[PDB]
Amino acid sequence: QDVVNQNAQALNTLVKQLSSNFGAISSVLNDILSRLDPPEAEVQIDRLIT
Amino acid sequence: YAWNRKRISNCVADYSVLYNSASFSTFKCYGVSPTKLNDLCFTNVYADSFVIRGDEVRQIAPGQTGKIADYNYKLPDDFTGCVIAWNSNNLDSKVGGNYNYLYRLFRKSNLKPFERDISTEIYQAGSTPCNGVEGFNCYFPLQSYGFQPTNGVGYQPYRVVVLSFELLHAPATVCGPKKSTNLVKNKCVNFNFNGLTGT
């Protein structure tokens, strides 16, 4: 059971990490993409990427 | 120090009409690209309007300094929206000078972002409690303006409005002229529901 539990916990943490701003103004790419021009969206997308 | 706050909601908006209205001194948008403003659906757009001196317009930004932006007006550091400002001199050209406006010199507590300074009464400056005599160490902060045509072109009166619209708060109501479209199912397609975008 420990194997299954640890794998599930790791997967859950990894997939939950998708909902953090990391400093950017959003947590979903499409928002920043439709809300900003590229010459500015570059830095935000870069923060999210790192 | 006394700015109107025109709460605006429940309509369809536009931006291009603000492109040919006038060559405003500054039309600067933070958090949103002024080109895409007619593509997303906001939530409870606000509207603050007032008139200042043309050189002070730089103070209107999230984290500037300046007597006006320190004792009259305050923006949050996470502001999302934008500022429009244009020289209003031809309509505010009083050769004797227009003196119907005032602003602060010093305040006990500096303002939080977006809080009205209704405390427009007598002000104490230092020691010797004046108790409403405007004597020594009790200075009236309300100083008039030098708005006249003979003044500097940079010191002319400027009309400013700051569209401060928050995002992702409620069922959106302020998106622009984007047209509706029939609805389909069971096909991997794009969509856009009140700004909520995806595929």
Burial B132-166 (b: 16+ CB within 10 A, else e): eeeeeebbebeeebebbeebeeebbbbbbbbbbbe
Find out whether B36 and B13 touch, Cβ atoms under 8 Å. Answer: no
Which of B56, B136, B135, B150 has the alpha carbon at shortest distance from B103?
A: B56
CB atoms A31 and B197 under 8 Å = yes
Output the CA–CA distances (angstroms, integers) from residue B169 to A4, A31, A45, B50, B93, in the order listed: 38, 14, 23, 27, 42
A35 contacts in B (CB within 8 Å)?
A: 31-33, 36, 40
- Which residues, 6 or more positions from B144, have their beta carbon under 8 angstroms from its beta carbon? B99, B101, B102
CB atoms A40 and B33 under 8 Å = yes
Find out whether B112 and B76 touch, Cβ atoms under 8 Å. Answer: no
Nearest to B31 among A25, A30, A34 (CB): A25
By DSSP bridging, strand B4-5 and strand B191-193 are: unpaired
B91, two tokens: 């309509």
- Name the method of structure determination: cryo-EM
- Which residues, 6 or more positions from B134, have their beta carbon under 8 angstroms from its beta carbon? B122, B140
What is B119-133 written as a DSSP string? Answer: --S----SSS--SSS
CA atoms within 13 A on the CB side of B63: 4
Distance between start and end Cα atoms, chain B:
47
B126, two tokens: 């230092």
Chain B positions touching chain A (beta carbons under 8 Å): 31-33, 35-36, 39-40, 80, 197-198
